[PDB]
Symmetry: D2
Subunit: 119 residues, 4 copies
């Protein structure tokens, strides 16, 4: 049930497709990265998660480059998909903007974003 279209609390939509081998592909839009543009996402997840009831570990990388804009930065999400009546993707993300060696200390951000299927 991981495949689908997901939305975060800031409105950023997360269209994702899961493969049987554990692949993860999709797109990203809506502000937080860049205002209105498509960004290609790719990551991985485990195809055989625990059967006792537990979040499905997954993650994906989105580098903000496309045919229009390029912020020289990538946010790489890492969380687990919690199934149930309402599907949830609670993730922690690290936006790493490409900086010089002097500014490399302030290059990487960190945060959290929770994704739901309804919006």
């Amino acid at each position: 049930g991981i495949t689908g279209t997901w939305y975060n609390q800031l409105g950023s939509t997360f269209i994702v497709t899961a493969g049987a081998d554990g692949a993860l592909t999709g797109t990203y839009e809506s502000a937080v990265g860049n205002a209105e543009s498509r960004y290609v996402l790719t990551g991985r997840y485990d195809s055989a998660p625990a059967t006792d009831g537990s979040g499905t570990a997954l993650g994906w990388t989105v580098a903000w480059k496309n045919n229009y804009r390029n912020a020289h930065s990538a946010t790489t999400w890492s969380g687990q998909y919690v199934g149930g009546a309402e599907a949830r993707i609670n993730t922690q993300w690290l936006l790493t903007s490409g900086t010089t060696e002097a500014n490399a200390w302030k290059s990487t951000l960190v945060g959290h974003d929770t994704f739901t299927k309804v919006k």
Copy 2:
């Protein structure tokens, strides 16, 4: 110069291939996640980084599962590739193990790993 075989300070080898579209593919081995096994990695990077001299924003996801072992966890690296006389990949990473809703607060780890081409 981003494509190649990379090693972290703990000995974990990071074989990576970069595509012209910004794709990032490879494998991960050597202990830190699991002792001796191949793990598929996929991520992204910007194909047109800044020309003034700056790290190339990149990232990759590795869900720790293969044909042999499955730790129900995904380790997700996010950093920038710094070129020069010696190539360097300074990254922050978030290993998110799949846990229950009760243990979801202790699911995600954070760290750093720097990758060089020589070992």
Copy 3:
């Protein structure tokens, strides 16, 4: 308005006192660290935040040692206090358990905890 008693979404209570010099003192309880025990907290904040409307940069650390239990770990919170009709403390935290040099890669956790005044 930063001083008070705060609660996170997991029920952990955050009693805090702010000083005019920017000091931050209080206690921490309720499960997430240890089941039922008082833990001393100390941190800092800026006593002259921006007047245009912005979160107040604050942070604190709690090391789980007391007269009863000792987990050899510290979670060190860093966030900003957002004032308004409902007071909010949105924080990111890093639980660093004391490990050996071999396990030092898995020592530090990361997460988020939001604190409100009502519970």
Copy 4:
């Protein structure tokens, strides 16, 4: 052996005093936060760490405000002190700048800083 004057890889000096109760006090200087200014630090650590050989859990908060400069920011270090022939403090830090609700996603930074006693 935790009390002393510590230096990170980027020249930032970390003068710290530890108390028997587990307290932690000191100052911070040298660029990364602000170019040349004193910044008050206070934190905590466990006074009874493991005796089998392991890092001593510690943390501290520094809010960049003083009598001269105020960046409305706090970097809140969380790491363990590793003793031995050379004393080491390997820490992860989260710099949270006080931002508005719109910019609150890009408020918190993440990184690492290792502190040694020699410089």
